[model samples]
Target: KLPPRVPNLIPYVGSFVSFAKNPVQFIIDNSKKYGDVFTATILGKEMTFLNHPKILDTFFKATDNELSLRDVYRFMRPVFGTGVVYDADSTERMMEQVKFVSSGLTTARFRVFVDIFEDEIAHKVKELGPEGTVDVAELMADLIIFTASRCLLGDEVRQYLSEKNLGKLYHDIDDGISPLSFFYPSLPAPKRDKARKAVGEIFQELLDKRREEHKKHPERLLDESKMDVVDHLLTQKYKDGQELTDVHRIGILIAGLFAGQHTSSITSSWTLMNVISNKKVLEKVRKEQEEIMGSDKVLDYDKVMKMDYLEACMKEALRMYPPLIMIMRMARKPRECEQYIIPKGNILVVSPSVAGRCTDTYTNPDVFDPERLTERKEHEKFKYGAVPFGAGRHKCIGENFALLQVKSIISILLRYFDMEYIGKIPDPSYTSLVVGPSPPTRMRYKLRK
Candidate 1:
């Protein structure tokens, strides 16, 4: 007889326990017993977790009729609204809606965002007044908030949401997602509720103001006068001749803003921390910047890309602490994978952290070597290991743009300041939806020549 519901491992211990402890380790241990795929009760429901790389590829390439984003994004419906693409598998419509916005992710615009982000960092560092210690994680978050606001949404929205409030909103919302949330997204809590309202209100206000302005002057819609991801999305259309609503529009914008800043901010902080601790890496990074920029004061696009050593350090840091430690998706119908049947409505989980360290894919996966990625083409062959930006059509649209921005910001900072971590390497906290360093990793820095 088939076991009744995969035998609960901890019927008494709350499904969210995995989140409280180290989620990555928890999942790894469970996989030891259940193998790559297993069913568990999360968020008060049974969800199947998929681990194998091959299955993950299948999951990615899986048709919407089978593995649907909508099924997985149900938890986000309240925040993202009804018309959001994640809530529906309208690929044709999504492609149309995203076309214009994708075009705006130009090399030129990305360079602009990078310059703005670097300026903000320099200004903040200057405000730190030449000598005291500060939490780079916290400080960088604020910088990215304003930078992202300027580059992605424009200064109008930046004015409404103070850098402080944006900081709060960013921390709160991003902090809210965890492995527990992935399993049981319905946990009603005051903090999560408040965060939703804060973020939603800001997005809604920005959406309404932009729409009103454009309605009165349709010519301003694509004036090309103002460039931001939002502007492109506003002028975009759907395959069915329908357009995204204010709420849905905000969801998309919020996705980019949150995605752009959160990880980039943290990743930059981590790289800086690593450089400060590792003198060889720091000096090499500085030397590269000097060779490229010929001056430490400003960095242009080409100049920034030329700093290959810095890029490698950043890539190495990313290997250690990926912004999203794990990814989860739900299947709309039963799917068979390697002699196992993942039933309809079950969840699939992929861990890049694990796969990145797999022996078959990465030699000595535990080692911190950026040189390994120099042959990125070789690693690209692995489905799950190469998912830093995710996979399939739903992979993050702003990936290359995000990397460019992060690389530039860190490079500029490296030129002006030398940073060091206040504490030992902090363990990255893993939740279902996201991961970042547990805070108070205070950093002390001094101006570099």
Candidate 2:
């Protein structure tokens, strides 16, 4: 029933080593021995790997049928309730939920939001304008958090940025949802309980405040009809005629902020570091910005979309260091690949990092060459070259939003300042939950002013 290439293995032995050290490297190295398809364990579950682009495409094609986000997202139940689309099962109801969520992320609305996102990022960066180095990752994270909070929640959380308690509560909530916490989350840790409660209470307070404000001001109510995704969900009526309740609404709000901010922030840092480390890449990005904006003009949304080379550079950064190194799903039934059979209930893993650098997809794949993408007219089959945002129904919804936000913010920084790498190249330590350069990625920036 299985193909010759797919290996069968025992449960709980993680196929690839260095999960905590450098997962991308580990996965790439192992792919050489295991070939494109194999089996491994994650958090005690047996999982299979499909490392090649053709195999990945075959895997992605099974979405909505053999694979579902809900199966993998079950890990997020404590943080996101069962009612949200992320946890929705594959049914008519699930289909409706998907439609409603996707409706809020239309291309037109995304373009408008990209402008707003850039404005918010530029505003925050200007606060420390042309100054010494700041931790771009942390700052970018904060900026996207506020931008999402303002857009999705309508300034309730954004206006109160100085509220340290709220910030802590939000961070704790995020940590609680991490892969480690989810797989073996503690139930009785005093600190963990406190963080969870804090997150809930903060949301309750915001909800109550919005309710009271609407009752009094009437015109001030942030209705879903007029608000962003949060509002859309709050007011949405799914095919089953179910209106989102307060608890579900809270979950949606929290999920939006986290998904909107976390990956984008860390990714922004990676892109900047790559640009700084490669003088040629950095110079080309700057020159393109200068050519269009005259070196003095502020880098805005429209200006960002215009910089094709910078976009390519960011793509390369993702190629080199993807935000999510691996994409996963659990098999609901036995499935047959070209030569292998994956048994029912096993987890399926696809390593984008390994596929992105395969010699077939990219020549000299290891070298940091942005030109492979930007310098060409006709292109090869691409072969899942770099799946920074992922693929299929489960692909990150905020990808366009994330890219524009990062590009605009980095462009603004480069225009008014130069970020010089003040230390050795980052030796990235990969934790399957997220990827980051060790030593916290230090840099010193000189203000162009």
Candidate 3:
């Protein structure tokens, strides 16, 4: 016996229109009416939604076998390349590959990555000129992508950014990510296919070049202690004597870029926009940086992490407009939550946006107050109360890396310039996979005197 349906007039297509038009509002309204657990059908598929923290445990605590995150993300296969994540031929091998990849994302490696991003950001800041208006959306997209490429894809990959045509190629690949991709992945989008193939080919080409060099100069490969993620992927092997293929290697890199790039870009932009809008928040963050670095100077990993106010601002931004607005999982077996017994094959939907806005957690849920995070630690009370990155084993692997990227970009920009939005902060456009500030995100900046 599943939870009661969120009353539908259209028979089978229950609440589809409401959900399709505005997911955040629909979820909030349904949660209010149905309490913790409820069911709704959209486009012929029935989904069980877990609203509050108590019932959310059924979604988060269940094993992968019981609740498949991979199944939910199957739409990403064509975009990320086959045999990478959910498309992997062997489950055990994929797990091994995942473990191997996790090894490269250590705090020490992130410290090194911070150094790379600092240089990229400094260069970008200098390019922004002494004083002018710039589109933050465009600036952040390039900055985050370039930083991610330099640190994750290696120095060799960074060179491609300079070539005009290659830069467009990357953009085309990125543009392939659309709201429709979630629903109609196999939809005949020729440019998307071409861009996907081109990007994967480039990764394959790079991997081949690195392997050839290593084969020819084995001693040189051994002499170098620090190599980028590309090298790591090349060397990693599964327990059953299966090494990553060209497709798999490229897929891994693509997944890394996919995971980090857009989400970090928008979050950084939002954090800056929010801080800029609020004068007191801006002053406090600037003062905190000054106290940490003494003068207007770039910060290292440890110093960057110490900016508590900045972290709070970032958290608040995430709470308000999370990158992934809603996450879905498929129930593989019958599961019980609250008084409802969800049937096998039912989709489980959870929303970070809805959870963050719940009055049960925060005093003024709609307000952009970073102080709430610092003063009370409102998000820490419940496991599912404020899950921007998510919870459980399938939670975002790039959480630390993404946070570091946003912090680094903001801190570096603040150290060099005083910024203000050219217009009002745009509302989040929920049409895409990741929620982003609607276009015309222009900001004016003057270099610190």
**Model 2 per-residue lDDT at 253:** 63
Clashes of each: 6, 5, 0
Model 2: ten consecutive residues of lowest lDDT: 2-11
TM-score of each: 0.85, 0.85, 0.94
Rank by lDDT, descending? 3, 1, 2
lDDT of 3 by residue, 329-419 (tens): 8888998887779888888988888888888888888788998999898988887888898888777777888888898889888878889
CA lDDT of every candidate: 0.67, 0.65, 0.79
Off by over 4 Å in 3: 75-77, 174-177, 216-225
Model 1: lDDT of residue 14? 38
lDDT of 2 by residue, 354-389 (tens): 776777677777776788887752124654555777
Query: For model 2, what is the alpha-carbon lDDT of residue 329?
Result: 77
